Design a protein around this nucleic acid. Structure first.
Ligand SMILES: [Mg+2]
Ligand SMILES: [Mg+2]
Ligand SMILES: [Mg+2]
Ligand SMILES: [Mg+2]
Ligand SMILES: [Mg+2]
Ligand SMILES: [Mg+2]
Ligand SMILES: [Mg+2]
Lengths: 670, 666
DNA sequence: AGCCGAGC
DNA sequence: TGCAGCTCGGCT
DNA sequence: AGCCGAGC
DNA sequence: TGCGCTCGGCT
C-alpha cells in the first residue's frame, strides 16, 4: 500500500510493505522542522523513516465532537499514513500486521509548546488506541543543516522512548487533557507553583507518560498561565509588556509599520515566539472600536479592524502603522522606570516584571486570557470614574462601586448582582410598521447580528424587510414589519425579541499579584484596593528616588558653579597643569567626585563632570546661566521634599485627565 | 469564490452591470466598502492577483489552465470565438462592461494593458462597443463616480497596432524603437522643460511609462552593476553599518524606510537573498553575508529558508569595493525631501562584470556571466600602466569545469566526468547553473529507468555530494560505457552547455541604455570613469584635509595663547569674545566653511573644546594632532589618483585572499 | 520548455 | 500577499 | 456549538 | 506561517 493525496508526506520507502513495523513515522513541528529531518536522513534513511509535518497544536480528541474529529484533516492524514483504524485493538502481533509504520517519532522544538504538541499526540494515541502504547509505539527525537546530519548520525543518543508503566500513566494523561479534570489541573498547578516558590527560597532512555506529564508538560501548562493571564499591577501579559517596553525605548515621533515594530520588539525585548502572534498582539493593543480598548496605548494608523467584524477585518501588518498614544507615558511615567525590576534574557536587559501605571489599567481595557486550569476575564471600566475613586481613596474616603463601562457604547449596562450584568443595545418604535436599532450590546458585531438575527427573522418569518445605515463606528438598522407582528414583538420585550440583551458574568477575575502569585479576585473593588496600596507605596519610592537624584544633581551643579566662579576670579588655574596635579589639587580644595555618579553607584575621584565642560562655560552669559540652573535645582529638590506621595499622584492624575480630555475630543471631531 | 457578484448580474439588467476587476484583494475591499449598499445591485467586484497571462501568443494549454482568466470568463459570461457584433450576441453576457481598478502607478498600468490585451485578442468586437473602462484614484470616490470613471475608446486601426506593439511576442524590435524614441525625447525635455481614452493614447502615453520604468529597474548600471532596488539595499546597509547580523525581513523593512523603496517586500527580500548567495554559479563576490540557509547549488537557491528566519550583514569586502570616502563624490537622489540612494556607487573594479549582472525589461534584456575578480584587478593594474587589458573569459568562483571560447560572446561550459573502470564513471562537476537535484531528476533518473521515449543507459548511480560539491558514481555495462565514450562522455551525460552573451545591455554613467559588444568595452568605459573619480577623490581629500589642518592650527593657537595668558575668555561676553577672536585673526570654522563652499564668524570649534584642553597632556596631544594632520595633507598631496587606486586594489586583494581562505577552511 | 529576477 | 487548523476555561 | 487571544 | 503571471534572450 502507498499513499496518494498527502503532498507534505515523505513516505518511508519500506512503509506499508513487509518491513512496515520496522518503519518510523517522524511527525515534526512545522514544515521547517520537516526539512531538517529530511536533510539529516539523507538518501539512506529514506528507507525506514517517513516524515510528515504538523501545523502546530493538534485537535484534543478526548472529548471533541464526532464531527470535529471526522473533519480534522491532520488527524485523518496521520491515520491514513500509519494505517490506523478507529475501534481496533492492537494487542496481538497479528493485529499489528495492518499498520504501515511500527512507531511514531515526535520531533518538536525542545520548548514548552513543543511539549504541548507531544502531549496532544500522546493524548490522541492514548484515547483511541491505548493498546498501542503498550507496544512502545511512541518515541521522540530531542534536539539542543550540518547539525541536523550529525543529530541523525548519532540518532540513538537523541532518541527517547515513551513507556507505559501502569494506571498512573492513564491518570496523568487524563489529568492533562480531559475537559472533566479542570479542578484537578488547578490543584496540580497550585502545588507546582508553591513547590517551585519553596525551592526558590533556597536551591533514562525510557520516559514514562506519568513523568512526561508531571515533569515536562506541566512546564508548558505553567508557562501558558504566565503568558496568558494578566498582571494585576499593569494589566499586561509579558508579550504586551515587551511591546510597550520596546515602544518606550524606541520613542518614535512618527508612525511605524507594525511588522517593523514587531521585528524591533523581537530584537529589543527577547520575544521568542512566532511573528504572527506578536503582530496580532500589536494590532489588539491599538484597537479602538466600541467593545475593544477604553484607552488604546498604541495608535491604529490604518485599518486595524472595526465593530462591523469585531476587528477581524484588520488590514495586514505590512500595510498598517502605529505609534504610542500621547496618553501612554502619562499613564506609565518615565521617572517610574527607575523603580522597576528589569528582567534579563541572557545578558540582555529586557522588559520589567511589571510597569506601575498611575491607574489600574487592568480595569481599563478588559484584561482577558485563557491559560491551563484558570482563565481571566474582566470587563472594561471608565477611566475618569477610576481616577475619581483613586482621588477619593487618597482623601481617605470610600471608593464608590463601579459598573463596567465601554467607551462610546450608547447602550445600557445594569448590575443584576455581584459580577452579573445585563448589557442592552438600543431599539425604538418609529411608527406602527417600523422599529429602528441604533446600538448593539457590547461585543455583538454588526455583521454577525445581521446574519444571525435579522436574516433569520426575514427568512416563521417575523419581519418584512430591513435596511442598513451603519457607519464604520455606529450601528443603524431600520426594520419593517406588519402592525400585528410589531404589536406582538412589542408585547413581548422588543429587546428580547431582537436579541439586544446579553448577560455579562465575571466570576473568574484571576490575575498575577505583585509578587507573581496567581490569585482569584472576588470584586473589582478588591483589585482597586490592592492596586492602590502598591501604587501609593511606589509614589513613596518615587519621592525618595527623586530627592536623592535631584540632590546629587544639585551637589553636582554646586561644584560646577564653584569651579567656574573660582576660575573666572583667578582663585584656581588649570592651564598647563598635569592631570595628576589637577586631580590632587581639586581633591585638596574639597571638590567632590561626580555626585550623581556616586549616588547611582550607591543604589579614584572623578572630576570629568567639571573638566568636560566647554570653554564657553567661562563666558559671561554661561556663568550667569550656570548659576540660575544651580539655584533652580536647589529649589526643585526643596519643593519636592515638601510634597507628599499623594500630591505627586494627584499631579499625574490631573496631567493625565487633561490630555485624555484633549485626545477624546479630537477623536469625536475626527 | 473571491467573487462578489452583482445582484442583477445574469438577469435582464445584465448589460447595465459593471464588473470591477481590482488589483489584489485589498483593493477589492475598498471597492466593496465604497460600493454598498446601493452599489451592490449593478456592480460586481473581483480581484486579480497581479500581472495577468499575456494570451496573445500563449499556448492553448496555458490559456485553458489559467484559473484567473477562466474565472473572469465565467463571471462575465464570455465565450471563445463568439463574435459580439449585434445586439442578439450581447444578450449572453452577465455584465455589460468591465471596470479596471488598479494602482495609479506603472505596474497598475501594466495590468490595465494586459486586460485590454486579453479582450482585444479574443473579442475585438467587444472593444468597438466600449466594453472596457477604468476607475482612477473611498466611499467618497464612488459618490464622485463619474469624475473618476474613464472609458476606453476604440478609434481605428492605429488602436490595433498599438496594443499589438505592446503585447505581441513578434514586436520586440518595434518596442526597442518605440522605447528608443521615448528615451531620446524625454532626454530632450530633461534639458529644456516638462472622459475618453483611445487605446493608442493609453499605450503611447501611459503603458510606455511602465515599459520604460521596467527597464530602469530590471537593467543594471555599468558603473556599479546594481539595479535601483539592489542599490537601495547596499545604501541602507552602509547607513545602518551593522556590526552584528540582522534578520533579512527586518533589514528589508529598514530598506523600505531609509531608502524610499515603494514595492512589495517579497521582491525586496528575494533581492536581499540574491545579494548574499555564494554557491557555485551565483555571486563571485557576495556583498552580503548569508548567515543561515540562503540556498545551495542543490536547488539553485530555491531551497533558501524564509527571510523571517535568516540573517545577513555586509561582507568585509563591501566597503573595500565601495570606499566610504567616495560617498562624498556621489549624487544622492531625493524621494519627497528624503535623501535616499545615489544614482550609482563607483566601486574600485567593475562589479557589473564580477557577479554577472542580468535582467529582463521591455524591449531589451541584459545578461553578463561572472568574471574573475583577480583577473579584473590585474587588467585594471595593466591599464593604469598604460597597457592594453588582456581578453577575459567568463570565470565562476569554485567552478571546477572548463569554459572555452567557441566564437565571439559564445562559450562551451563543461563539467567533469572521468572513466574509473570499465563499469564505472564518476561525475565531479556539473556545468555552471546546472543544479544537482535537477541534474539527478532530468538526466540520471531517466538514464537509469528509461522513459517512454528513451532507453536506459546506466545500471546504477550513487550520490556523494556535500553542500557545495558534486559527486555521482555511475555504473554501466562495458558495452554501454564503450558506446557513451564513442559518442562523447560529456555530450551523453549532458555536461556541456552553451553560454551566449549577445545581449550585454546596460545603462551607462549618463543613464543611457547601451549595448556593449565586448566585456573589454565595458571594462574600458568603467576604467575612464573610475580613474577620473580618483581624481575627484584627491581634490576632495586635499580640500577636506586642508580645512582640518587649518582647523587644528587655530585650535592649537588658541590653546597656546590661553595657557600663556596672551588671551583670556574668563567672564567676557559672547559678543566681546567673538569680536576679539576676529581681531586676533582667528579663522571662522574652516571645515564648515569648506563644506559650505562645496555647493557670522563661527568659533564654536574652539570654544566647544573642554576645559581638559587646557591641561598639560592635552596641550601636547593637540600639538601632535595638528602636526600629524599637516603631514597627512602632504602625504596625500604626494599621491596620484593612480596611487590611491593602487592602495585600494591592494587592500582589497589582501582581504579577498583572507576571506576566500577562511571560506575553504569552513 | 523553461530559466533568469524584480515586479504585481 | 490574505489566509486561518488547533489549545486552553468560562460562559452562553 | 463558538467567542475571547497568545500561542503552535 | 508558507505559499501564477511579465518581459527578452537563449537553451
Ligand atoms: Mg518553538
Ligand atoms: Mg481588550
Ligand atoms: Mg502598485
Ligand atoms: Mg547573478
Ligand atoms: Mg471549548
Ligand atoms: Mg515586464
Ligand atoms: Mg517566453
Amino acid at each position: 500500500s502507498k499513499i496518494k493525496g498527502i503532498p507534505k508526506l515523505d513516505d518511508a520507502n519500506d512503509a506499508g510493505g513487509k518491513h512496515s513495523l520496522e518503519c518510523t513515522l517522524i511527525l515534526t513541528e512545522g514544515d521547517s522542522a520537516k526539512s531538517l529531518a529530511v536533510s539529516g536522513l539523507g538518501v539512506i534513511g529514506r528507507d525506514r523513516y517517513g516524515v510528515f509535518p504538523l501545523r502546530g497544536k493538534i485537535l484534543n480528541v478526548r472529548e471533541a465532537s464526532h464531527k470535529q474529529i471526522m473533519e480534522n484533516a491532520e488527524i485523518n492524514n496521520i491515520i491514513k499514513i500509519v494505517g490506523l483504524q478507529y475501534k481496533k485493538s492492537y494487542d496481538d502481533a497479528e493485529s499489528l500486521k495492518t499498520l504501515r509504520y511500527g512507531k511514531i517519532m515526535i520531533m518538536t522544538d525542545q520548548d514548552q509548546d513543543g511539549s504541548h504538541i507531544k502531549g496532544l499526540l500522546i493524548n490522541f494515541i492514548h484515547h483511541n488506541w491505548p493498546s498501542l502504547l503498550k507496544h512502545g509505539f511512541l518515541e521522540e527525537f530531542i534536539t539542543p543543516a550540518k547539525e541536523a546530519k550529525e543529530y541523525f548520525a548519532d540518532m540513538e543518543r537523541h532518541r527517547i522512548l515513551f513507556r507505559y508503566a501502569g494506571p498512573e500513566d492513564d491518570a496523568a494523561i487524563t489529568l492533562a487533557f480531559s475537559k472533566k479534570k479542570i479542578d484537578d489541573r488547578k490543584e496540580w498547578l497550585t502545588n507546582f507553583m508553591e513547590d517551585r516558590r519553596q525551592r526558590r527560597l533556597h536551591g533514562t532512555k525510557h520516559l514514562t507518560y506519568n513523568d512526561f506529564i508531571n515533569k515536562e508538560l506541566i512546564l508548558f501548562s505553567n508557562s501558558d498561565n504566565e503568558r496568558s493571564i494578566p498582571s494585576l499591577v499593569d494589566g499586561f501579559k509579558p508579550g504586551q509588556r515587551k511591546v510597550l517596553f520596546t515602544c518606550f525605548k524606541r520613542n518614535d515621533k512618527r508612525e511605524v509599520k507594525v511588522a517593523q515594530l514587531a521585528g524591533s520588539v523581537a530584537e529589543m525585548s527577547a520575544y521568542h515566539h512566532g511573528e504572527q502572534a506578536l503582530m496580532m498582539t500589536i494590532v489588539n493593543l491599538a484597537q479602538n472600536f466600541v467593545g475593544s480598548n477604553n484607552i488604546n496605548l498604541l495608535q491604529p494608523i490604518g485599518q486595524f479592524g472595526t465593530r462591523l467584524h469585531g476587528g477581524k477585518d484588520a488590514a495586514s501588518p505590512r500595510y498598517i502603522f502605529t505609534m504610542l498614544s500621547t496618553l501612554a507615558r502619562l499613564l506609565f511615567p518615565a521617572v517610574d522606570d527607575n523603580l522597576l525590576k528589569f528582567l534579563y534574557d541572557d545578558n540582555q536587559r529586557v522588559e520589567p516584571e511589571w510597569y506601575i501605571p498611575i491607574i489600574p489599567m487592568v480595569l481599563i481595557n478588559g484584561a482577558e486570557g485563557i491559560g491551563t486550569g484558570w482563565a481571566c476575564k474582566l470587563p472594561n471600566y471608565d477611566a475618569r470614574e477610576i481616577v475619581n475613586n483613586v482621588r477619593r481613596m487618597l482623601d481617605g474616603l470610600d471608593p464608590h462601586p463601579m459598573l463596567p463601562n465601554y467607551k462610546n457604547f450608547k447602550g445600557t449596562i445594569q448590575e443584576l448582582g455581584q459580577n452579573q450584568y445585563a448589557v442592552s443595545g438600543e431599539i425604538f418604535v418609529v411608527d406602527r410598521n417600523t422599529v429602528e436599532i441604533t446600538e448593539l450590546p457590547v461585543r455583538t458585531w454588526t455583521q454577525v447580528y445581521k446574519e444571525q438575527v435579522l436574516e433569520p427573522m426575514l427568512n416563521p418569518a417575523l419581519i418584512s424587510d430591513y435596511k442598513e445605515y451603519h457607519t464604520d463606528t455606529t450601528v443603524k438598522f431600520v426594520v419593517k414589519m406588519t402592525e400585528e407582528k410589531l404589536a406582538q414583538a412589542e408585547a413581548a420585550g422588543l429587546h428580547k425579541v431582537f436579541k439586544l440583551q446579553t448577560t455579562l458574568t465575571c466570576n473568574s477575575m484571576v490575575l498575577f499579584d505583585h509578587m507573581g502569585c496567581l490569585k482569584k479576585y472576588e470584586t473589582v473593588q478588591d483589585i482597586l484596593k490592592e492596586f492602590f496600596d502598591l501604587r501609593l507605596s511606589y509614589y513613596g519610592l518615587r519621592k525618595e528616588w527623586l530627592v536623592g537624584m535631584l540632590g546629587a544633581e544639585s551637589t553636582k551643579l554646586n561644584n560646577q558653579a564653584r569651579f567656574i566662579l573660582e576660575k573666572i576670579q583667578g582663585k584656581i588655574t588649570i592651564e598647563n597643569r598635569s592631570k595628576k596635579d589637577l586631580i590632587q589639587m581639586l581633591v585638596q580644595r574639597g571638590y567632590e567626585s561626580d555626585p550623581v555618579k556616586a549616588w547611582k553607584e550607591a543604589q579614584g575621584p572623578d572630576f570629568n563632570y567639571i573638566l568636560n565642560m566647554s570653554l564657553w562655560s567661562l563666558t559671561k552669559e554661561k556663568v550667569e546661566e550656570l548659576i540660575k540652573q544651580r539655584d533652580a535645582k536647589g529649589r526643585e529638590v526643596n519643593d519636592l521634599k515638601r510634597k507628599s506621595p499623594s500630591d505627586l499622584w494627584k499631579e499625574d492624575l490631573a496631567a493625565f485627565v487633561e490630555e485624555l480630555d484633549k485626545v477624546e475630543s479630537q477623536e469625536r471631531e475626527d
